[model samples]
Target: DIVETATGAGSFTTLLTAAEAAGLVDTLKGDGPFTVFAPTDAAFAALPEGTVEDLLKPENKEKLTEILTYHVVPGEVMSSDLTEGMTAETVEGGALTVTLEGGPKVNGVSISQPDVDASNGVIHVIDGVLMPG
Candidate 1:
């Protein structure tokens, strides 16, 4: 399960909460060969003050959903599958730029662990939450 996989990581409490707040818990729990760019709690804290709390509001559900889904790409994209200068379309309709020049980065966010296998998809733990431009 995607939820279980992230929670097991121990660094994704904020990500999990945001996912549930965005009403994506069930969706992520559903069948998906998704490639998720999961950010850590520290990443969430890196955001502007009150950002997380604001996004958790019911009125911000759509925005929250957009932000969360921006981390997910269709299909299972393991680290080996990623190439420099590659771009992957996310489930949120955003595009993530992949760069390998200085290790690994996704849309400017460094990846802590490039490949974490899950039953429903693959996880690439990122250093920051990805938000659409």
Candidate 2:
């Protein structure tokens, strides 16, 4: 459902492609209510030259999956559930810091659009992609 929702949006084309390469499309489509901090096509394009291409390669699948999972938290966390200085545990086993001071930011990346609901989960459109340590 998350996959279909994102695909239908058109803005998440790059994200869906990366998710496919990472082999996480089915995971996103699973029954669990996942919270995805998804980056837009423009956000992916803003990355360093060839960054997306490099990650999409077969050899970089592990790294790509790690980075993608870092943006996903296990449960459906809506915008209203966020609090200042909240730390969300991600599917990658890393934590993302949430800040509501200036605006809604997760791990220093601004959440451009929030609370996009799908049949199985929610998506928050981010201004940038995040990486795990």
Candidate 3:
């Protein structure tokens, strides 16, 4: 459902492009109740120059997939279910720290919007794109 919502929202075009380049659109569209921390085109544009372009290159597919997967969790995680100072392991095998102190922040990327329901999963719109450390 995240995929459908994203397509309809018209804000995740950059993310869609990246997913397509990484060959993950099909996977994400599949029956996966996946929790996606989706970033907008503005978020990608905010990245340092050449960063987005480089990641989209065919030679960087592996790295691109790594970065994209960093935003996903195995199951749905609603906003109500999140807590401050919690950590969630990503599908990419990395852990994202959740800080709810000032506001909902996951892996340093502030959750601009939360609980965007999808048929297969949920999506939390993030203000910034996350790069795997």
Candidate 4:
């Protein structure tokens, strides 16, 4: 469902390209539900100069994986279930801090859009791409 949603929306072109390059399209398309903090093409463009290009390089596969996985959590975490001070462990083994005090924010990446339902899981579109520290 996420794959379909992504393809249908048609704005995630850059994300689709990265998913293909990282060989994660199939995995994301698989079952069990995954919450993707998808970033927009503009978000990728907003990266420091050469950042996206650098990450796309073959030699940066490991780094790219880390960066991408930082956008993923293991299970389905819906927006309603999210609370202030809650933290979710990312696929990259990084922890994303959840703050609901000033409205929901995860790892400082504001939820520009929320609760994108998929057959397997959900997707919360984010404005910025997060990097693992």
Candidate 5:
């Protein structure tokens, strides 16, 4: 249902395309109630020139997969479940640092919209694309 919600959201076109390129469409559509820090189309456009294009290439699948998976956390973590300075373990094996000072942020990017529910998970729209260290 994550796929359906994202498809219907309109703004997630770029994200869905990237997910398809990463071969993660099935996984995201599957069960487990994942928590996705979804980046909007504008956020993808904000990346450096050619960044998205490079990642979408067939040869760059591994890197693309890592970056995409980094946005996902195993479990249904909603906005209310977030806490100050909380560290969430991402599906990519990286930790996402949460800060709630001015507003809710994950990995230093502001959460544009929170709690977009799906049958299989929840999506939180982010202002920027998150890269794993």
Candidate 6:
């Protein structure tokens, strides 16, 4: 229900649409709890002017998919499961740093909202779109 919940939320339209363009719509809607560090539409828009536009191009689907997958973790991770400095592996094969002390930070992006429950996973709304190193 990742796609459904997020689509319903309205803020993640850019994300859901990009996932569809990347041919990953069904994956997010599937069963098995995954953790999604969701970047809001504003977050994507906050990128360098042409970044999101370029990513939307057909020729960039491969890279687009890689970037999209980077936002997902394999299993359910509630906000309570995180701690300061804990790192989790992402579907993109890169590790992300999650900090829960004082405030929450996922890979250096500030988390605006955490532990948004969904049927298939949890959503953590982030202020910026994370990129793998």
Among all candidates shown, the one with the greatest TM-score: 6
lDDT of 5 by residue, 1-133 (tens): 5566435646665555445435676777666787777667677677788977764455544564556667666674654566456776876678767666667787777877665575577777777766651
Query: What does candidate 2's lDDT look like per residue over 1-133, in tens digits?
Result: 5567435646665555445435676877766887777666677677787886764455544565656676666674654566556777877678667777667787778877665675577777777776652
- Over 4 Å off, model 3: 2-9, 17-22, 55-62, 66-69, 82-85
C-alpha lDDT of candidate 2 relative to the true structure: 0.65
C-alpha lDDT of residue 41 in model 5: 69
What are the TM-scores, per candidate, against the unseen true structure? 0.69, 0.72, 0.70, 0.69, 0.71, 0.73
In model 4, which range of ten residues has the least summed lDDT? 13-22
Error (Å) of candidate 4 at residue 50 is 2.7
- Looking at model 6, report the run of 10 residues with the lowest lDDT sum: 14-23
lDDT of 5: 0.64
Q: In candidate 2, which residue ranges exceed 4 Å CA deviation? A: 5-9, 18-23, 52-62, 66-69, 82-84
Clashing pairs in 6: none
Clashing residue pairs in all predictions, respectively, total 0, 0, 2, 1, 0, 0
Give lDDT per model, in order.
Answer: 0.63, 0.65, 0.64, 0.64, 0.64, 0.65
lDDT of 3 at 121: 74
Worst 10 residues of 5 by lDDT: 13-22
Better of 2 and 3 by lDDT: 2
Quick one: RMSD of model 6? 3.1
- lDDT tens string, model 4, 1-133? 4466444546665554444445666667666778777766677677787987874455554455557666556685664566446776777777777666767788888867665675567777677765552
What are the C-alpha RMSDs, in order, of all predicted structures?
3.5, 3.3, 3.4, 3.5, 3.4, 3.1
- For model 3, residues 1-133, the per-residue Cα lDDT tens digits are 5455435646655554444434566777666677777666676677788976864455544665656666666675654566447776877788777676667787777877665575677767677766562
